[PDB]
Design an enzyme around this catalytic site. Structure first.
Site, short mmCIF file in Angstrom:
data_model
loop_
_atom_site.label_atom_id
_atom_site.label_comp_id
_atom_site.label_asym_id
_atom_site.label_seq_id
_atom_site.Cartn_x
_atom_site.Cartn_y
_atom_site.Cartn_z
N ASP A 1 1.86 -0.66 -12.46
CA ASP A 1 1.53 -0.86 -13.90
C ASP A 1 2.51 -1.30 -14.88
OD1 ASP A 1 -1.17 -0.77 -12.60
OD2 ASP A 1 -1.24 1.48 -13.38
N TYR B 1 1.08 -1.17 -0.14
CA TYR B 1 -0.08 0.00 -0.07
C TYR B 1 0.83 1.20 0.04
CZ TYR B 1 -3.43 3.43 1.50
OH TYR B 1 -4.42 4.69 1.64
N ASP C 1 4.52 2.33 -20.36
CA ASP C 1 3.54 3.35 -20.08
C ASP C 1 4.16 3.96 -18.68
OD1 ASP C 1 1.35 5.00 -19.86
OD2 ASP C 1 -0.28 3.36 -19.29
N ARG D 1 1.51 9.45 -13.01
CA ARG D 1 0.13 8.53 -12.61
C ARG D 1 0.67 7.06 -12.36
NH1 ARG D 1 0.25 9.71 -17.86
NH2 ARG D 1 -0.05 8.04 -19.45
N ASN D 2 1.46 6.65 -12.96
CA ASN D 2 2.11 5.42 -12.54
C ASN D 2 2.99 5.02 -11.77
OD1 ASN D 2 -0.18 4.13 -14.39
ND2 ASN D 2 1.04 4.50 -16.27
C1 LIG Z 1 1.78 -4.46 -12.20
N1 LIG Z 1 0.70 -4.43 -11.22
C2 LIG Z 1 0.65 -3.72 -10.28
O1 LIG Z 1 1.73 -2.98 -10.25
N2 LIG Z 1 -0.32 -3.53 -9.32
C3 LIG Z 1 -0.82 -4.97 -8.79
C4 LIG Z 1 -1.64 -4.47 -8.03
C5 LIG Z 1 -1.94 -3.16 -8.07
C6 LIG Z 1 -2.77 -2.25 -7.00
C7 LIG Z 1 -2.58 -0.51 -7.26
O2 LIG Z 1 -3.18 0.03 -6.65
C8 LIG Z 1 -2.65 0.83 -5.54
C9 LIG Z 1 -1.45 0.28 -4.88
C10 LIG Z 1 -1.02 1.12 -3.88
N3 LIG Z 1 -1.53 2.29 -3.25
C11 LIG Z 1 -2.63 2.77 -4.10
N4 LIG Z 1 -3.00 3.91 -3.53
C12 LIG Z 1 -4.04 4.86 -4.00
O3 LIG Z 1 -4.73 4.29 -4.85
C13 LIG Z 1 -4.47 6.13 -3.43
C14 LIG Z 1 -4.81 7.29 -4.18
C15 LIG Z 1 -5.09 8.39 -3.64
C16 LIG Z 1 -5.00 8.69 -2.10
C17 LIG Z 1 -5.18 9.95 -1.74
C18 LIG Z 1 -6.67 10.12 -0.82
C19 LIG Z 1 -6.75 11.50 -0.39
N5 LIG Z 1 -5.82 12.27 0.08
C20 LIG Z 1 -6.12 13.70 0.53
C21 LIG Z 1 -5.11 14.13 1.74
O4 LIG Z 1 -5.49 13.35 2.89
C22 LIG Z 1 -4.40 12.10 -0.59
C23 LIG Z 1 -3.96 10.58 -0.72
C24 LIG Z 1 -4.46 7.61 -1.41
C25 LIG Z 1 -4.41 6.30 -1.92
C26 LIG Z 1 -3.28 2.03 -5.01
C27 LIG Z 1 -1.44 -0.28 -8.26
O5 LIG Z 1 -1.31 1.09 -8.43
C28 LIG Z 1 -1.77 1.76 -9.71
C29 LIG Z 1 -3.19 1.59 -9.98
O6 LIG Z 1 -3.94 2.26 -8.64
C30 LIG Z 1 -5.34 2.26 -8.88
C31 LIG Z 1 -0.83 -1.26 -9.03
C32 LIG Z 1 -1.05 -2.65 -8.81
#
Ligand SMILES: CNC(=O)n1ccc2cc(Oc3ccnc(NC(=O)c4ccc(C5CCN(CCO)CC5)cc4)c3)c(OCCOC)cc21
Ligand SMILES: [Cl-]
Length: 267
Positions: A162, A98, A144, A148-149
């Site tokens: 990603d 995370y 990519d 954003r990634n």
């Molecule tokens: C090759 N395969 C992979 O790499 N993957 C496999 C599984 C996998 C899962 C993934 O998701 C993950 C992972 C870890 N962390 C996250 N964090 C967030 O989304 C997040 C986003 C925004 C906030 C904000 C909340 C609000 N405040 C405001 C002030 O308080 C500011 C922080 C807080 C948190 C997502 C990922 O990331 C990319 C896609 O994300 C959708 C890649 C992944």
């Protein structure tokens, strides 16, 4: 029915699912109980990628392929590492590290004028370079690479996301854009745009340039300008990443070597 892998299999009763984090497959926040078997009573905050409700058979195949790829690559500080999975008797959950502070674009956009120094921005660039040096050494092409990634942890660690999946056009190299030839050198082009993103605090590249015009501008040899809060040395690194012939671009090894020296000298 998916085959079980004892190395990575977490029981479902050890995973408490939380709020949705992001909406090419669904991700949710969760808490994993006893991942490190040294300390089985410890809770760990994790991201859990899964399929959407209206997901195809091909989507499952991609998500399995994504999981198997992450097993092979192994652990590094500057990538989103696999921590476990739930494959049996329910939906596929791919459990990863995370990153509490979200993606790098939003992180920088929020912190535009707590403030980040010059040293913090080059440190951020170095960590993305160090993570791509690892992925390159494990033969993984990103295809990519962008702010954003890249994700950002509680302890300010930059983590590439990603990587290696089976608008984005502004980050693509010309050979990737025209001919669909994705290489390690086309990821360096993308890293050059990622540098430009860092030193503009999450800027939108090639602004007011449509898709049709962007093909010609790169062919004719036009590049993005230097950012205001950015040195000449760091802009040369961007321009070297944007070299027209792919062989003439620097490697991630060189970029790690160059950025290590710059972080040391910066205040
Ligand atoms: C090759 N395969 C992979 O790499 N993957 C496999 C599984 C996998 C899962 C993934 O998701 C993950 C992972 C870890 N962390 C996250 N964090 C967030 O989304 C997040 C986003 C925004 C906030 C904000 C909340 C609000 N405040 C405001 C002030 O308080 C500011 C922080 C807080 C948190 C997502 C990922 O990331 C990319 C896609 O994300 C959708 C890649 C992944
Ligand atoms: Cl495990």
């Amino acid at each position: 029915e998916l085959p079980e892998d004892p190395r990575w299999e977490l029981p479902r009763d050890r995973l408490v699912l939380g709020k949705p984090l992001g909406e090419f497959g669904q991700v949710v926040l969760a808490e994993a109980i006893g991942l490190d078997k040294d300390k089985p009573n410890r809770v760990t905050k994790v991201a859990v990628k899964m399929l959407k409700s209206d997901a195809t058979e091909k989507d499952l195949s991609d998500l399995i392929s994504e999981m198997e790829m992450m097993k092979m690559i192994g652990k590094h500080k500057n990538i989103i590492n696999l921590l476990g999975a739930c494959t049996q008797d329910g939906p596929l959950y791919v459990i990863v590290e995370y990153a509490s502070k979200g993606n790098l674009r939003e992180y920088l956009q929020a912190r535009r004028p707590e403030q980040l120094s010059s040293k913090d921005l080059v440190s951020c660039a170095y960590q993305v370079a160090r993570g791509m040096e690892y992925l390159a050494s494990k033969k993984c092409i990103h295809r990519d690479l962008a702010a954003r990634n890249v994700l950002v942890t509680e302890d300010n660690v930059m983590k590439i996301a990603d990587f290696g999946l089976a608008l984005p056009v502004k980050w693509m190299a010309p050979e990737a854009l025209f001919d669909r030839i994705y290489t390690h050198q086309s990821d360096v082009w993308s890293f050059g745009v990622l540098l430009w993103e860092i030193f503009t605090l999450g800027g939108s590249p090639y602004p007011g340039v449509p898709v049709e015009e962007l093909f010609k501008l790169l062919k004719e040899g036009h590049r993005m300008d230097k950012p205001s809060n950015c040195t000449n040395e760091l802009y040369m690194m961007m321009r070297d990443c944007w070299h027209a012939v792919p062989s003439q671009r620097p490697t991630f090894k060189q970029l790690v070597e160059d950025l290590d020296r710059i972080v040391a000298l910066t205040s």
